[PDB]
């Protein structure tokens, strides 16, 4: 759909504003933050209007992707509230996050009733991202009451995501089950950040427990999907596992428990090995979309590794994660080059996304290791952006509008990696 295509483009625009807000933090520019705040408001309104049009037509997936775009916009607003130090900006972001949350929660209930378990899971992703925006808005506002509100909403999404996962697993909707576990994992991240905001190590310990549970359910789905030869479903399950390990690493920071940090690093390495393995099998079979999705999970796993190195204060662990990020980056570019030569521009665009996420991991690992590596991550971020720009151009010339939009997401993610690298610089 033109509505799905529209929603993917808005997701790309919303991610780019996140990068501008991060750039305002690194440079300390209050004027850039206000500019980013204004851009986030406009994008949020565009996403709301797309969601309204999509729901009226009955397109539940397109409406769900639009609400994700809206929720990412609120995170940009929240982030901007930090760069500006404007507590009224954070309070405005807090209310927009609740609005998006309620729309997404209602959208999930409607999709599940109609049987659209995929739309329901994507709707729950929008809700979980909205809760992350609320928890960040709590940090920006210094409001432990908003943080507690985020914590309660995170448990609600996690509960519903776990419910939909078991419902989707019963009828054999393995892709819907895996996407449901992605929402659950993002919900645990939101709970972990809410624990940092609330300064509650008890909530942090709870987030660590839930992250281990989502992780365990994700590996169950990956094993079942793999046995049946459904490599795309198995790859999406590994995305959920990798996001769960990110939640655990953040929870370890919130709890100040280096034993959880070392455990996250262990789980992150396992996901990394499973994803790289699944990518090789898909590549031999020519299933380049599955291979590209697997390398997204690999790139997210290295992010968890880098954050686990921050939680452990281990500069040697940070250097290893940096080198692993460069490895996943090169594999992703291999999948993209092969995909572009065959004309599978969606597989190429998905692989471009994996490459840009791998540069985020390199940038975060450079921060943990402490400046020459940050400069390299910065330059690698420019290169990933350029590779995604070429893919978007080739896709448009091939008449593949959705692949062009997926590549725009890759461009914006590379811009986030560039901004994070600028923080270290």
Numbering used by the authors: -1 to 368, 370 to 424
What text does the study give?
Here we describe efficient routes starting from validated parallel and antiparallel peptide assemblies to design two families of α-helical barrel proteins with central channels that bind small molecules. Computational designs are seeded by the sequences and structures of defined de novo oligomeric barrel-forming peptides, and adjacent helices are connected by loop building. For targets with antiparallel helices, short loops are sufficient. However, targets with parallel helices require longer connectors; namely, an outer layer of helix–turn–helix–turn–helix motifs that are packed onto the barrels.
Encouraged by the successful design of sc-apCC-6 and sc-CC-7, we extended the seeded design approaches to target α-helical barrel proteins with five, six and eight central helices. By contrast, the six- and eight-helix-based targets bound dye, consistent with accessible cavities, which were confirmed by SEC-SAXS and X-ray crystal structures solved using molecular replacement. Together, these additional designs delivered the de novo proteins sc-CC-5, sc-CC-6 and sc-CC-8. For the parallel targets, the experimental structures show minor fraying at the C termini of the inner helices compared with the seeds and models, which appears to improve the packing of the external three-helix bundles. However, the symmetry of the central parallel helices is maintained. The backbone RMSD values for the repeating helix–turn–helix–turn–helix motifs are ≤0.5 Å, which is expected given the low sequence variation in the loops and the hydrophobic cores of these buttressing helices. The parallel designs all showed some similarity with natural and designed helical solenoid proteins.
